[PDB]
Design a protein around this ligand. Structure first.
Ligand SMILES: C=CC(=O)Nc1ccc2c(Nc3cc[nH]n3)nc(-c3ccccc3)nc2c1
Ligand SMILES: CCCCCCCCO[C@@H]1O[C@H](CO)[C@@H](O)[C@H](O)[C@H]1O
Length: 337
């Protein structure tokens, strides 16, 4: 019943993988671990195989390993990275030391598809629609991505897009409240990021290319105005209020005069995404119903996720406990259809 494994030296460690995975070729390495491209002879798919580095070295490593495996096992959606396989050469918990994760091999990310050129409006609709479709799903599991950017968006040769948890400055796509360490984030932090991405795809230019942390905020407030009276009512920070109070007011710009020549429906959606007040930003579900996506929207096929039990985040367990829980998750894995 156990697959036959083989051993091969790869990124200067011995990999031990099921024989179904052929022709491993290193493609990436870092603190996280190392990744090889491979061909899965069982499915006929090109896949990425990641060997976790030091997955049980410490309590923190072990809880991170568990977290990553739980998250990948949960995500089952066309526009979100999912798990094709997870395996260990270990024949028991006693010998369990290594964790390998398998997903679709992804060629390129959103940066590659755009490469500083305007996309057509039809192409923007399709790409943003997919991102929002995956976000509706992620957000329905009560998960916030928090670091949505082009490098975290994989796109194949059929223009099919998947949201990733890994890969320019990251800061360019971050919501202002995250830049200010606000610490009670709305899921619409991700909608901010989507707005930044959409604007760049339409114009071929980064919307808010800040040079440093404060510059990023400066460029943001120039577009969306300084905080209104309704927003200021909601700021508990004495230091923030007093600073904002001191600021010479700027109105919000008219996006129609900013995104010259764009589809007016695109402009309208951007206005709804890039609102300073996070409580007033459009949600992923609401955005999917916006007229901009008329050619793609289908309420019958914009699914939500099963509830995701994140109670483990609150727990302080020992290495061997996190390891045992991770082993349970490896053993219980059922590959997708
Ligand atoms: C700060 C942490 C960090 O950057 N972590 C990374 C980085 C790259 C990952 C990766 N890269 C690639 C390359 C081609 N496909 N996947 N692939 C994978 C991956 C590979 C197989 C299954 C699940 C994830 N994970 C990566 C995790
Ligand atoms: C001068 C810089 C002003 C930045 C203002 C960003 C306001 C973001 O919006 C705020 O997000 C918080 C969640 O993080 C919510 O609790 C608040 O209700 C909401 O108004």
């Amino acid at each position: 019943e156990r697959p036959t494994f083989y051993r091969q030296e790869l990124n200067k460690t011995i990999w031990e993988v099921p024989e179904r995975y052929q022709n491993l070729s290193p493609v990436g390495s870092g603190a996280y671990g190392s990744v090889c491209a491979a061909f899965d002879t069982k499915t006929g798919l090109r896949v990425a195989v990641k060997k976790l580095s030091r997955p049980f070295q410490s309590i923190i490593h072990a809880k991170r390993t568990y977290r990553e495996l739980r998250l990948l096992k949960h995500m089952k959606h066309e526009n979100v990275i999912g798990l094709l396989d997870v395996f260990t050469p270990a024949r028991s918990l006693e010998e369990f030391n290594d964790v390998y994760l398998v997903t679709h091999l992804m060629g390129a990310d959103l940066n590659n598809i755009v490469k500083c050129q305007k996309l057509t409006d039809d192409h923007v609709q399709f790409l943003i629609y997919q991102i929002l479709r995956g976000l509706k799903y992620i957000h329905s599991a009560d998960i916030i991505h928090r670091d949505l950017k082009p490098s975290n968006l994989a796109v194949n040769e059929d223009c099919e897009l998947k949201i990733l948890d890994f890969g320019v400055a990251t800061r360019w796509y971050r919501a202002p409240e995250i830049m200010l360490n606000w610490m009670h984030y709305n899921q619409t932090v991700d909608i901010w990021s989507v707005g930044c991405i959409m604007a760049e795809l339409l114009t071929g230019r980064t919307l808010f290319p800040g040079t440093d942390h404060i510059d990023q905020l400066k460029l943001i407030l120039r577009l969306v105005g300084t905080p209104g009276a309704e927003l200021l009512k909601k700021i508990s920070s004495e230091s923030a209020r007093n600073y904002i109070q001191s600021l010479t007011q700027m109105p919000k710009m008219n996006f129609a005069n900013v995104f010259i020549g764009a589809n007016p429906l695109a402009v309208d959606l951007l206005e709804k995404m890039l609102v300073l007040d996070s409580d007033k930003r459009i949600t992923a579900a609401q955005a999917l119903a916006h007229a901009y996506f008329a050619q793609y929207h289908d309420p019958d096929d914009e699914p939500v996720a099963d509830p995701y039990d994140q109670s483990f985040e609150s727990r302080d367990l020992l290495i061997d406990e996190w390891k045992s829980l991770t082993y349970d998750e490896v053993i219980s894995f059922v590959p997708p259809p």
